[PDB]
């Protein structure tokens, strides 16, 4: 599973690995029977442990 | 100015970009480019050859 994007930076607490724009997501799905290609903006949810 | 999470520097622009007033008619730029042999040459003009 991959996460490709142009710009990268720290999260709120400080852990690396956040992409700040449209991000390409290559997520295999369907118990290895389907590949998702998403070009979306990913917003960190404020919920617990998110 | 940005310098947000660059991890390599500051990142400024005085993007004055002279905002020259819009002309009476809209004017546009076009950069065309074609490729051969990288696929089937499938981008073809409209015809009724038969």
C-alpha to C-alpha distance for B19 and B33, rounded to whole angstroms: 29
Method: cryo-EM
Residue owning tokens 């290609």? A37
Residues 3-42 on B with a CB inside 8 Å of A are: 4-5
Nearest to A38 by CA among A21, A23, A18: A23
Residue A42 DSSP label: P
**Chains A, B: CB pairs < 8 Å:** 4
Please name the residue of chain A whose CA is at the shortest distance from the CA of residue B8.
Answer: A9
Pairing of strands A8-10, A16-19: antiparallel
What lies within 8 Å, CB to CB, of A38 at 6+ separation is A24, A25, A27
Contact between A10 and B4 using a beta-carbon 8 Å cutoff: no
Rounded (5°) CA angle B12-B2-A39: 115
Length in residues, chain B? 50
The structure tokens listed for A48 are 């617990």
């Amino acid at each position: 599973a991959f996460m490709l994007g142009s710009s990268v930076g720290n999260f709120s607490n400080g852990v690396s690995g956040r992409y700040f724009n449209h991000t390409l997501l290559l997520l295999p799905d369907g118990c290895g029977t389907r590949l998702w290609a998403l070009y979306c903006v990913i917003e960190p949810r404020n919920g617990s442990y998110c | 100015t940005r310098q947000l999470s660059q991890l390599e520097g500051g990142g400024i622009l005085v993007g004055v970009g002279s905002v020259t007033p819009m002309t009476d008619t809209l004017q546009m730029g076009f950069i065309i480019s074609v490729q051969y042999g990288t696929d089937t040459n499938s981008v073809c003009p409209m015809m009724d050859l038969g």
